[PDB]
């Protein structure tokens, strides 16, 4: 999202915020669309290079990995056994994360017409704790 100014983002993207991804299903987490279903190695007319073939496989491997898991530098790095500071790739630092399921209770209708009818009331008490944190430089915590 290379939006320059909020006056550039879709009305509802900046009203309620941009759309997050659905929870992993089979159809809701397809393989990367640019995912190769085949790979050609230009061969000779009546011979193939047994050693070239080998190599062909080594390259496709490196490609496949980038496609499926290391689409991120910080990611192609980690698989090298190294690490990259959130300062190497200018990524906001995730300080804390809370997740929970919100619930509530049903309200029973009791008049002549809506007796046997209910309305679910979702009241969920939650709490989130961001442990003390040392701010290296000036910035915002979102």
């Amino acid at each position: 999202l290379t939006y320059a100014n909020p006056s550039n983002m879709p009305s509802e993207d900046y009203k309620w915020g941009v759309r997050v991804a659905n929870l992993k299903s089979i159809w809701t987490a397809p393989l990367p669309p640019d995912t190769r279903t085949s790979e050609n190695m230009t061969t000779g007319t009546s011979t193939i290079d047994i050693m070239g073939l080998q190599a062909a496989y080594a390259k496709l491997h490196t490609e496949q990995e980038r496609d499926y898991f290391m689409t991120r530098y910080r990611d192609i790095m980690k698989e090298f056994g190294g690490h990259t500071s959130y300062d190497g790739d200018n990524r906001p630092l995730l300080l804390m994360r809370s997740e929970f399921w919100a619930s509530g209770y049903d309200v029973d209708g009791t008049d002549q017409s809506s007796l046997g009818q209910f309305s679910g009331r979702v009241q969920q008490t939650f709490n989130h704790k961001v442990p003390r944190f040392y701010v290296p430089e000036h910035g915002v915590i979102m």
Partner: protein
Amino acid sequence: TLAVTRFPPTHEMEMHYLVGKENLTYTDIACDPALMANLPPREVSLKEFFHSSPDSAKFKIAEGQWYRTQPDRVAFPYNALDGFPFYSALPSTDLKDRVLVNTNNYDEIFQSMQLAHWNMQTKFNINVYRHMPTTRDSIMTS
């Protein structure tokens, strides 16, 4: 019983492969395990290792060999100095010759010499146990 005196192959003009080969590709600089572990030996020239050497004198190296090793390094201030047991001259275009040591490139390291490059004075204390006649029983027709 034979002797052989040698000096480590320190040339005054050997350059680090990666620093002598101009454009660095992903394969040369990343040291991707998958790659190094799976393509043919690389044919290189005395030119990717020595500062003036012909593009034409080739030899086959193992991919990523430049990452398993490190040449010795001799400052230019030296290559103009006789008295240092180093390799001044350039290699020998030819494989063989440029491996089996080039003795002559050590002539300049010594002062005067009618005792070659090296001389030795040793007392060979041998002891053989036989079943020999004897000194008197051989000269004793008897």
